[PDB]
Every structure is written in structure tokens, then in C-alpha cells.
Amino acid sequence: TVFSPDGRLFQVEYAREAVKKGSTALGMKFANGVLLISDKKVRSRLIEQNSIEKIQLIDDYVAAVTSGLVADARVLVDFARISAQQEKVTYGSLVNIENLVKRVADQMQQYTQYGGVRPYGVSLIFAGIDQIGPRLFDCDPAGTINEYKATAIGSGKDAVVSFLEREYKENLPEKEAVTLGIKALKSSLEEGEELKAPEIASITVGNKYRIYDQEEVKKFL
Amino acid sequence: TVFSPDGRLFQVEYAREAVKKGSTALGMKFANGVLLISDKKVRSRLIEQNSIEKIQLIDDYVAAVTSGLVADARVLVDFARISAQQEKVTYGSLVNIENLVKRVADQMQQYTQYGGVRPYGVSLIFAGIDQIGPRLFDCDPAGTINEYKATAIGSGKDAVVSFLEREYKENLPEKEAVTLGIKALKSSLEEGEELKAPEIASITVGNKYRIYDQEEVKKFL
Amino acid sequence: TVFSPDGRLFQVEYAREAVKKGSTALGMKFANGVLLISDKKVRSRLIEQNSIEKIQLIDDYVAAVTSGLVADARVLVDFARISAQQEKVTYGSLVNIENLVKRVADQMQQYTQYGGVRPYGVSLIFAGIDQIGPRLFDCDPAGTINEYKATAIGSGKDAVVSFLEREYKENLPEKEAVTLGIKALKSSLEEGEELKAPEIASITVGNKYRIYDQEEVKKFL
Amino acid sequence: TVFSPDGRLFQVEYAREAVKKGSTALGMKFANGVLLISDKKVRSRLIEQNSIEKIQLIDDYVAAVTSGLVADARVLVDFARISAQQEKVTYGSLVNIENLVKRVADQMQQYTQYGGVRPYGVSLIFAGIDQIGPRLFDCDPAGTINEYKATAIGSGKDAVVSFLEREYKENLPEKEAVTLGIKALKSSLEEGEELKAPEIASITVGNKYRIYDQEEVKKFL
Amino acid sequence: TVFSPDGRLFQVEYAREAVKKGSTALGMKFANGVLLISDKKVRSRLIEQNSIEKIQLIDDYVAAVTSGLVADARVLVDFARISAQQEKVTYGSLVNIENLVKRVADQMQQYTQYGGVRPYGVSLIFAGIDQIGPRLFDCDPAGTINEYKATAIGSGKDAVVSFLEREYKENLPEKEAVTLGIKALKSSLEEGEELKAPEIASITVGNKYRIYDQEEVKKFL
Amino acid sequence: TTTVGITLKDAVIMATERRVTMENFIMHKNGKKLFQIDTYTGMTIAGLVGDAQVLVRYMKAELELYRLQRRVNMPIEAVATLLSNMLNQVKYMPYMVQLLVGGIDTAPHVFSIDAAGGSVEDIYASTGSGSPFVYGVLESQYSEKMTVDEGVDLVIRAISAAKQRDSASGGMIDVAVITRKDGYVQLPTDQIESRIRKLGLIL
Amino acid sequence: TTTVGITLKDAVIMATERRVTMENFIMHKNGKKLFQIDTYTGMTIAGLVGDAQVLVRYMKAELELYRLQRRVNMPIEAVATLLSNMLNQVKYMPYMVQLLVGGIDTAPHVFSIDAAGGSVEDIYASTGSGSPFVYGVLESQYSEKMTVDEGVDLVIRAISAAKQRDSASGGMIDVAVITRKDGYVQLPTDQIESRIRKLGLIL
Amino acid sequence: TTTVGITLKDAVIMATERRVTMENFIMHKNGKKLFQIDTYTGMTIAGLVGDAQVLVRYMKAELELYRLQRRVNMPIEAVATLLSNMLNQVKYMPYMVQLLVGGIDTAPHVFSIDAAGGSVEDIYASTGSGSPFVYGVLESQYSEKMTVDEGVDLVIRAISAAKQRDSASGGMIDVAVITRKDGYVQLPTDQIESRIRKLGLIL
Amino acid sequence: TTTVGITLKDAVIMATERRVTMENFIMHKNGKKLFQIDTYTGMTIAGLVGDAQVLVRYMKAELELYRLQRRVNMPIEAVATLLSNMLNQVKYMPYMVQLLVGGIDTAPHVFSIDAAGGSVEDIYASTGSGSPFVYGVLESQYSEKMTVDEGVDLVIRAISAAKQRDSASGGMIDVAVITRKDGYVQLPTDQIESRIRKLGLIL
To answer: Which CDD domains would you find in this protein's record (chains A, B, C, D, E)?
Structure first.
């Protein structure tokens, strides 16, 4: 990973191409809470649907979704889980989720500066609750971070983001936020493609994460 | 292993070409159990067939079968065996086979990111019983994992998977699962060619693995 | 990073191209103080504004603003924060800010001389108060440092510097300095353009840094 | 050593070409025993005949023959000897020869996966008696292993193996097995070319290895 | 040093070209002993004739000559001397010279397999007495060893070897062996070219090495 | 210090007092020695406070991680085994502690773990300087047939008896009950104070 | 040495004296033993002076860094946890200290940390050779219902009592009051001298 | 502790009691000291509990791995040799244990392994504080010609005698019988209790 | 322990007893202390059993490796030198052993090696607690002119005398004879028993 004459790092831009191939996922903040929704390219009745989930708990209060190279993503989630526990052991709690996201992002930044390694082909959304409130961040192959009220990653990102730029409202009730999220995800599907059942997870201030089961998600389809 | 402009890792895709040349193997879950069947390239009557088996016990409750570079596969099976024992020593038991599979897949992922090494040219199917129940996983040169009700690896993978997608039924009795698997494997030998006695192993909840001997396999041919 | 026949380090010159793409920021000394102003590439109401911090406190008396690769910049800010703490623990205070800027610059210089790494694609302005007085420095991908009365970094650098070259005067009251700074930044914008609310921070001798809130910034727009 | 688009490791295939240039050797199991025969590339009458033997005892119950780069071969025989002693010290005996062969093969496999080193240009046949019984293995530059009833390595491998596939049967008396091995080796010679006295060694259950003297070998010519 | 498509290590073959350029030397066994003779290509009256010898004692019972890169040869002779002393300290004596020769050859082999180094451009003849008897070995850049009754290295190798293949007899008296050796060496020269005073050393069972003085050497010219 | 863990049919009750001394000096009357470390798992600590507190932090972290990784809670015997490995590995530079681990997986379990990582499962156990007084009460009064309510009364009686005879024990009794239904639940102080009254006891 | 920290409804008060001895030798009459380490956080030090001073510098540095990184102050319990980890990690080559950490986050807190990293929260606490005398005064006179002015007089009485009976304690009494409203305020010496007079005490 | 291993014609019988003490303090009445470590291999533990338990875990894991790698069970003498190497390697920082390893390969074997890795095969052996009492019973009563039923009675008599005279021994007697035909069989408690009654024994 | 090695014109005879003690406790009556380590080389062990057994395994392995590498047996003096180097290299963390190495190369040799690697050749030597009694017998009765049959009787007499007076020695005597013609030959127990009877001795 070296600079081109225009100051670009092409190996990082190419890692971002891998991310674009992943299934669409989104996050959004709502009244006293945050949620994640993830589409899945479920491809065979022979797969176990309940396994290798797109939404992964980092701890009881923080979850992540990823897009891009799936093995790379697992390594970064493993890193995030261990880094969260190190912080909890050191201080007793995780006060600001942004610092955890930064640590993950720094791990990714390193793999764009040192020779002998390629960048991670992964983008992540982290969502959870900390002492500041409900938080929503994304992180890309370069280790670039942004905090959002709503955001998306993966192949359908641009459609989902355009939809949200128009339709998103702050401080919605959870149910209405989920409905809007499902609508946003549908808007990104190709000619007559049907949304077959995404993963949904949500958290509200003073509670731990809730993972929706299939039957609850169906009530939004 | 670096990114192409389209975000692909060609060295990993090439490792996956070596796996395609391997002998066909399959796994499927049935009533309270899981089984593995492996075809073998028998390439001389001078070989001892009773040795260097495609199906390998990782412990009494977990087995694997591989396709691709055979020396690489042996290294990974060795790693899986030692990793299983480390978990058993640390905790007293192996609660969830998925974590063992993830450790093996992480080892394979690392060899796709770091310079100075090539990826493993291996795919694996892991099958066994843990605290969750009967489990069936596959793992490829990238370290990508999936859980399945039935799956296959090797040259006949596509044909075996097509067959099973049409003919597979959950919760078959063992004899019927084996018949189906033999039938699936036979359909991948496209031209008028005979299936020699494959390797068969199975396990049911509450029991240890058993390897079908020469004569019991013949009863299905 | 090696020498060309004319004695140039092109990889460092290319890193300098990355910096030219970053958002515009400036610093200027005024009567008994120094200030920083940063413009922000804010695009999307879906972004959290409060979480954006282009001006980053290094300690209570020293702040920086950066331009270029954002993840690289975060790493250098983290380095500067830790380096500042190490000096304060060793001696009990930071007597001369130039030494901190030199340690950060030495880190950058190292990545232009040793193989196996690329330079940081970052320029920084540091501003604060030490025992010498109010200080303003910049630092580029080569680790070249300069001390200034006024200066700028990022895409609008050339326009802001030209403006200041013409309009800057020493020992302005803070209000007048901030007014000058806003006018300087505004000059760098294209055909028919605001200029949303920028970040402003200032410090005066004997005090700690203050970050202007959104409403105090509005007064200058 | 990296993957071709068809998933091949050409540097390993090239190491295999070095083995094809070596002197022919073979092994075969017989009634309660195993034997090795090696052709000799003896040129000058100025050479000491009794030295640098191609059959090499690993311990009293295990022997090897090699073909390919002779310095590489010596290094691997040295490794096998020390590895055998290590196992004997740890457990008090060598229960299954296959594990020794796998340790050697793992050393060879590592030199096909890591950068900075070339593969060993060697194939080995290991033969001996363990707790399972008479054993016969081969091992190639990839670290691929197989167990055999009969096998060969080196230039005349293909002709020797063809002959054995046509003529070999299990459980021959030792004299008949040696007679067969000699015939097989002569089948690999060029027209009108005489077989000089090869090296022969054999072991039977309950005994240690014996090396045939030149006079015993001559009786078979 | 990697494999060509035909399984050759060209960097090793090229090292062997350096060896061909060296001055001719030879060894031969005779009745209860072994001798070395080395041609000295004298090139100026300003040189101290008696310094930097081709024939080097490794200990009182073992000597070597070399051909090829002289600084490389020096390093290997140094290695051989220290390796011999290590063996004598460990066991009290050096039982079999072949083991010493193998350690030197293994050092040479390593430099044909690992990256970051080139092979030694050296061949050596080792000659001495051990518990087996008079010994004569050679060793080339690959670390290939052979034991001989008579052998040679250097530019005139092929001519000397041809001559000895015709004229050599085992068990000659010392004086007759030296005479044969001088004759062999003279036959490797270009017609017109006269053999100047060579080095001669000899050792017999029960005795230490003796170097022939300039006067006893003349008696053979 | 006094801590106790008892098993009943489908439940575990753990309890401690709160006194922190240095020799005869009562520095703290309200130390915490009873911790939830997982959904259905609790731990008590006796011995060197800094060592014990580090271990509580490590267990809270590791059991949470494990739960997220395995999608199931660590089995109680696995918690005891993990601790056993950790403590034995440093036996010559040890955590100077005695630990009880109690919890429910398919069955209730109490394990007693020593500073060399020796771990033994028991139907009940007690640690700290006040433990022999507890063992007297439990030998005389424990029944495997007790209800949770009777078990809570029993541990209160046992710890109260220890407080009367062990000057290194004192302060409010803390009690936790662990069930499959409610997981680990620390009883409210008011409830423990109410039981102390109705049992006719002190402090 | 004598240091004290008490909590009141929305306040923490911390105080020390200033005597530094080498056995019986009074080297310094005016050592500093009470430090602001964050916006609403104070620490007192007792024990080996060089060790305590290094930890004060480390805490000032780390809490400043943490504040800038997290954009909020380290919670007081997190301060005590960090110190706990740090001190336990070198327990066999320890910082030979006793620390009080006090401050306001969502509520007032005082923690007492020992040389092995054991940390216990309390309504009030005291460290150093003078602490037993302080604990007598506090046991007799502390009330959770006290105003800040009453709590300031209390710590002055407690430390003055310790100065009368502990030869390793002495010199001017330093006092800080920590509130959300006013932050960390070290009371001026003139104010403390005035209270010493009005309470009928000495020095 | 008391453990014993005896050999008979085609069998090994190993047995222990279950008491775990700290000095005179009986902390656990039902510790486990006899373990199956391979298909036809058993181990008993005596000495420092944490060390012994680590070794049992290490042996279970290693023998299982070895079996899968070699396709045959580790020979009993190889098990003893492995342990001998591991214990001697750390003899200056030892596992403070006495071990018995017993089992069947082509013949019955009992080996006794000490804390320096000294390993000696015997027709019978006993470890722990109760072993001298066991050795008296065995010297007087053991016969190479005994049947399995006679051997089981003997070990029960021997450990019962040890429990009468060694206060560090106690609790229920655990017995395992190892044969080629039936493998490793831990005898049901009811069967041992019945033998204890018929032999006319106590505790 | 008692071990002995003597040289005769073309032979070496080595012998030990078999008792293994911990203090006064005879744990094993049939330990092995005499080992073939090469074709014509034997070794006896005295001292810490774990250390000695490790060294027996190391010597068997290294002498086999050496024979394969050199195509000749390691000279007996070379065996002693290797041992001398190994033991001295760890003299401050030593193998707590006394070793005899005996064998035939071009001549019979007995060497005695101590725990610091001091190695001395002798015509005869003895190690272990019983060795002084052995030296008495050898001083009185050894003759360089003895036949192998006479030397075997002598060592049996010597060890029998040691067993009478050294309570740490006992059990069956093991004897090995080493010749060029017959190699290392361990004498059958029936033959030694017959000599004991014929010489009028005990055990």
C-alpha cells in the first residue's frame, strides 16, 4: 500500500470494492435507542439459517454488522470483542463506544501503512448504548470512522442512504423505526426481488440488546 | 495475496481451484445425528486403502473430511486436533464445535492476509455432536465458514449439492440418510462409472463416532 | 521511499497530494493568544455533527487540526496525546511545545526513510501556550516543521494564505482575529458559496483552551 | 511457492523433477516383513563402494531410501533420526512409524508454504516394523504421504511400479520378494544395460534390520 | 536458489563454475595412509611464497585443500576447525571423519535452500586418519559428499581423474603414491607449462600429519 | 471473612458478610464479597482483596466473552476448571484467595477453589476465617430437602453464628439466590434484615 | 501521616496534614499530600513518598488523557479500578502506598486503595499512621446529614485529634471540597486557620 | 488420602477414598481421586490437589490425542514414561504429587510415579498418607492368584483399614476394575456398600 | 542402593540390587538399576530415581543415534566424556546421581561419574549407600586373574554383604556380563539364585 501520484492508496480503494459486494445492512437511531437491520444472501434450503449471523454482539450493550470479506470480518469482530473486555477489566465499564470503534479502526489503519499485509476488505457498523447515549458509527477498510443518526453498508448502501436522507426522522418509536428501516431496505432491491427475512436487533437506554427472532421480524414483512 | 481492482483475492481463488480437484465428500444431518461420506481416488492396487483416510477423527465427538492439497489438509487436521485438546484442558469440555471450526478458519484466514505465506489449498467439512446438538460445518481456503443440513466438497460438489437440494429430507433415520448420500455421490459420477466402497462415519446424540467397516459400506452399494 | 536522480523523494511528494485533498483549516496568533478555525466537509443531515472534531485537544493548553488521510491523522493525534503525557510525567510540565511537535515530526520522518512503510498522508497545525508564549506550528508528511504567525492547511490553503499574506496583522483582539479568520476561510470557497458553521477554538495566556459552541460561531457568520 | 490459476504449486512440481533424476529404489512388504532395494549410480573405480549408502537406518527397526538432491536427502535423514530418538525418549518406544513419517513430511510441507525457502528436492521410502506390523510409506517434496504394499521412487519409478502392479502379491517368502524386486528393477533398465549389484535390506517381525552383503545380493543377479 | 522447470538449482551450478577456476589439487590413499598434493599458481616474486596455503590442517589427523572463492574457502576451513574441536570436547575424540565432513557439507547445503544468502563457491577435499582408517572425501557447493580412493578438484580435475582412473593402484608405498600423484598433476597441465613446487602433505596410521618441506618436494620434480 | 454456598434441588444460595480488616483494625464495614459473574453464576471471595478483585474482573470479562462466542453460558464445572488452570499456572506467585463458584446449568453446583487451583464440587461449602462456625451450623441443620426460603434462613443463621465468634467477620449479610427461572438475584437488604428479626438474631 | 475523605449528600471533603518524616526525623513540615487529579476528583497519599508521587503524576496524566479521549471525566469507580489494576500488577514489587480517591460523578464517592490494589468504597475513610484517631472522631461525630460547613469542621477536628496523638502527623491541615456546582476547591489556609480558632483547637 | 492399584492375572483394580483436608479441617467428604484417562487406563492422585487435577486434565487430553494419531492406545509403560519426563523436567518447580497409573495393554500393569518423575512398575502399590496401613494389609493378604471379586474385597479391606488409622483419609471407597473384555469399569456405589456390609466393615 | 562394576581380562561384569525406598519406607522391592545402553555398554544408576531414569533414556537414545551416524559404537571413554559434559553443564541445577558405565571397545572399561560430571576410570567401582560394604569385599577378594564365573560369584558376594548391612539395599541381585564374543548378556535369575544357594548366602 503506497501512494499514487495523485495521493491515492489504490489497495485501500480496491478493498472498498470487496465491501460493495456484501449484503446490505443498516442502522438507525430512534427515541432512547438504536437498531440494526441486515439483509442476507440466503442461498440454499440446505444452509442452517440461524448460524453465522450478520449482526454480532460485541457485548450486551454494543453490536456490529459487517459487509465485505466474511473471514476478515470475523477476525475484526473477534478483535472488537477482546478489546471491549480489556477496557471493561481496566476501568470497570466501557464509557464511550467511540474509543472501542477507534481501536478497531486503528487495527485496520495499520494494515494500510505497513508492507507485508493487505488491508481488511470490511466495513462495519457499530451500534449500542454508552454513557453518552445511543451511538451509531461506521468504519471502512481505511479505518475511517463517522458517527451517524442513520447509515448503511454493502451493495444496497446508496439506495438505502438516499431513502433515509428523505424519509428518516429522529426520535421515532422503535416499531416505527423498524418499519422505516424495512422500507429503506426494500427500496434497494432489484426489479421484483423480495425481502425474505432480515436480521433485526435493537437496544434502548437502560436495557441490554434484543435480537428479534424470525417470527417477530415477519410481522414487519 | 493482494486485492485486484474488482476487490478479489486471486491467490485465494486459485487455492480454491486445488480444492475442486479433490475427491468428493459430503455430510448430512439426520434424526439425532450427522454422517460423513467420502469418495476416494484409488490410484493403484499397491496402496494400502486402510490408511491415510479422507475422514479423520478430531476427537471422539467430532470428525473432519478434506479436499485439496493433501499435505496442507494434514497440517490443518493436526492443528484442529491440538486446538480441540487445548479447549478440553482449559474448560473441561468442548461446548460448541463452531468455535473449534472458527479457530481453524482463522488460521486459514491469516495465511490470506500476511505476505511471505500462501493460503492453504484445502476445504474441510466438520461434523459432530456438541451441547447444541448435531453440527455440520464447512470451511474453505479463505477461512469462510457456513453451517448446513447437508453439504459437499471436492470435484463432485455441484452435482451432489444439486441432488441433495432436490432429494434431501430432514430427520431421516440413519440407514435412509446413508442411502440418500450414496445415491447423491453416485449421481456426481456422470459417465457410466462405478462407485467403489466409500468411507462412511456417523454419530448420534449420546454416542461416540463410528466408522463403517468395509462390509457394512458394501451393503449400500 | 528512495531518491530520484534530482534528489527528490516522490513518495513523500505524493503523500503531500493526499493532504491537498483535505478540508481547509487555519491558525493565527493574536494579542496574548492563538486560535484555530476548521471548515468541515459535512454532507448529509444523517451525520452526527457533535461527534465531528477537526480541532483536537492534545492537552488543556495545546490543540491540533489536521488535513489529509483521516485515519493516518487520528494515529498521529493519538501519538501526540501520549507523547505530551510522557513529557508531563517526566518533567512535570511541557515547557516548549516545539519539542512535542518535533517528536511527532520525527515519527513522520521515520516513515519516509525506512522501507516496508509508506509516509503518513497528513499535515497538522499545532497551536497552544507554553513558557515561550502563544505558539503556532505546522508539520507535513516529510516531518518538516515551521513556526508561524498565521498559516493554513488543506484544499483551500493557497487562497487562505494569500488572503492572510495581504490582510493579517499581529496583536489583534480575539474577536477581530476570529473575524479575520472567517473572512480568510470564506475567500477560499468557490462561486456563490457559504460556509456552514466551522469549528473555532482559542486560548489566551494564563487560561486553558476554549472550544466555541455552535451558537458563538454563528455570530461570525 | 504460490498458486497458479489452475491451483498448482509449480515450485513443488519442479522439486519433483529433481527426484525423477535420482537412482531407482523400491520397497515391498512380504510375509511378516518388509524390504528395500536400491540401485546404485556407481561410476568411478576411484569411489569407495561401501560409503554414502542409499539405504539408511533410522533406527534398528526403521530404514529409509531417498532419491533426488543428495544433500537435501541427508538433511531429512538426519531430521528423521533425531525425531525418532525424541519420540523414543518421550514415550519409551516408537509405537507407529506413520507418526515419524508425518513429522518428516510436515517439515517438507512447511518448505512449500513459507516464503524465503525452496522445497526439498527429495522423495523418501520408509520401511520398518512397529506395533501395527510391517510398514511401507513414501513421502514426496510436497510432504504427501501414502502407505503401500509395494512402491518405488527415482528415475525408473514408473516402470518399476507398472511391473509391481502386474506381478506383486502379498505375503511372499523373503527370497521370492527379493527375486520379484530385482526383476522389477531390471524392467526399468535401458536395452542391453546390465544391473549392477543393488543395495538390499530387510526386516521381519521380532527381528532388527539386516543389510544384505554383496555376496548375498550377487546370488540374485 | 530455487528450482528450474527441470528440477535444477542454477545458482548452485554457477557456484560450481567458480570452483572450476581454482588451482588443481588431489588426494589419494596409499598403504596405511593418505596424502594431499596441491598445485600453487605462483604469480609474482613480490608475494611471500610460504603464506595462505592451499593445504590446511583441520587438526593433527585431518587436512583439507580447497578450490574456488578463496575467502569463502577460508570461512569453511575456519568452520571445519571449530566443528572438529567441538566434537573432540564433547566425546574426547573424533571417531569418524565423515561426520565432520557432513557438518561442513550441511552448512553448505543450508546456503542453497534459504533465501537471503548465496551458496559457497567452494569444493573441498578432506583427508585424514580416524578409527575406521585412512579417509578421503570431497564436498562441493551443494554440500554433496563422496568418499574416494583417489580424487581431485580445481581446473585440472578432469585430466587428473582420467589419469588416476587408468594408473591408480591401491596400497602403494608412500613414495610411489607421491610419484604417481606428481605425474597425475603434470598430465593436467598445458604442454610447455612446467610444474613449480607444489604442496604435499601425508599422514600414516599411528602418526600425525606431516607437511613436506620445499626440498623433499623437489626430489619428486 | 465468612462466605457460604449451598445447593438445593434446583437452586444455589450464596452469602457473605462484609467486614474488611487489617489485623484487628476494621477499615471497612461494608466490603463487597459476593458477585454475579454470569447469567446463572456467582462467586464469593476470601483472602487478599486486590487479588480477589482482579479475579472477579477477569471472570466477569471471560464469562461474558465466552457466552457471546459459544451462544451458551459456560457450564459451572467449566468456570471452576478455567479458574483451576489460571490459579495453578501461577501457584508459585499465587492469587492469595479462596473462592466459591456457584451456579446452575443442567444442575445446581457449588465448587470451592484454593490458591493452587485445587477445585472440589460439594453440596455445600464455606470459606474465610468464619467458615468453621458455618460448617458447625450446616452439619447440624442443612437438609437437601429444604426450600429456597428455608435455605436462605439457614445461610443467615450460619453467617450470624460466625459473626458472633469470628472477629474478622461482621457487617450486613449479603445473600444471592440463583435459579433457572430468575438467574442470579441478590436479595434486597430489607428482606435479609426482616429475616434476621423473625429468626431472632443480631446485626 | 493522616488523610481523610468523607461523603455528604452532594459533596466530598478530603483533608490531610503535611508532616514528612524519616523515622523520628521531621524533614519537612509542609509536604503536600492532597491533589486534584481531575475536574471533580481528588486523591490523598500515605506511605512511601517517592512511590506516591509517581502515582500522582501517573493519575494526573492518565485522567487528562482519558478525558480528552472519552470527552467525559473518568467515573470515580473507574479511577479506583484503574489504580487497583496498576497496583495489583506489581504486587510483588509494589507501590508502598495507601490512597484515597474522592470525587463526584452522578454521586459523591470515596474509595480506599491498598498496596496490593484492593479497593473498597466507603461513606468515609482515613489512611496513614494517624487514621485510628480519625476513625474514633468520625465514629463518634460523623452524620450523613451534615452540611459542607459542618463536614469541614469535622475533618479539621479529626485531623487535629490525630496530630495530638500521632508523632508522624503534623503541620497545616489542607482541605478540599468537591461539588458538581463549584468543582474541586482547595480551601484557603486563612479559612482553615479561622475554623481552627473558632473550634478552640491549635496550629 | 489413600489410593491403591493391584494387578491380577488379566486385570487391574484401583481404588481410593474421597476425603480432602486442610490440616485437621475436613473440607470435602467426596473428592474424586480416581480417573479413567484412556480406554483401559486409570490414574489415582495424591498430594497437592491443584497440581494433580492439572495432570489429570493433561493426561486425558494427551492420551486421547495419541490414540487418534497412533490408532492404538498408548502402552501403559509409555503413559508412565511420559509422566516421568514431564515431572522430572520441572523437578525444581514440581508438581507436588504421587501418582498411580494402571491399565491393560498386552498385560496388566501398575506404575507408581513420584514428584521428580521417578517411575517404578510393581505388582501392587499405594499412595497417600494412608498407604502404610494399606501396605500392611497387602503384605499379609495379597495373592497373585486372586480372582477379581477377591481383589475388589482386598482393596476394600485395605482402604477400610487405612480410614480407621489415617485421619486424612475418609468417605466412600471408589473402585475401578480394568479388563481387556470389559474395559474400564467403575463399580457402582451400591455394589461397594454391599461388599462393605458382607466383609463386616464400617466408616 | 548398591551397584558394582568390575573389569576382568576380556570382560566387564555389572550388578545391582533392586530396593527403592523413601526414607525407611520400602516402596518397591523390584526396581531396575542396571541397563544395557549400547551393544557392548551397560550403565548402573544410584541417587534420585527420576533424574537417573531420564539419563538412562537419554543415553540409550544418543548411543543408538551415534552408532547409526558413525557406523561404530561410541568408545566407552567417549560415553563417560559425553556424560561428564552433560552433568557438569548443569552442575548448579544437577542430576542428583552416581553412575557406572562399563563396556568393551578394544578393552574392558569401568568409569564412575558423579553429579558434577567428574569421571574416573577404575578396575572396579561401586555406587550407592551399600558401596562401602562392597569396597570391603572387593579390597579383600578381587583378583584381576579371576574367570568370569569367579567375578560373577564375587559381585554376588559383595552385593549380598551390602544387603546385610545397608537397609536401603535389598531384593534380587541383577547381573550382566559384557564380552566381545557374546555382547551384553543379562544373567537369568535362576542362574543367580543357584549361585546364591551354592555360595551359602541369603535373599
So the answer is: proteasome_alpha_archeal
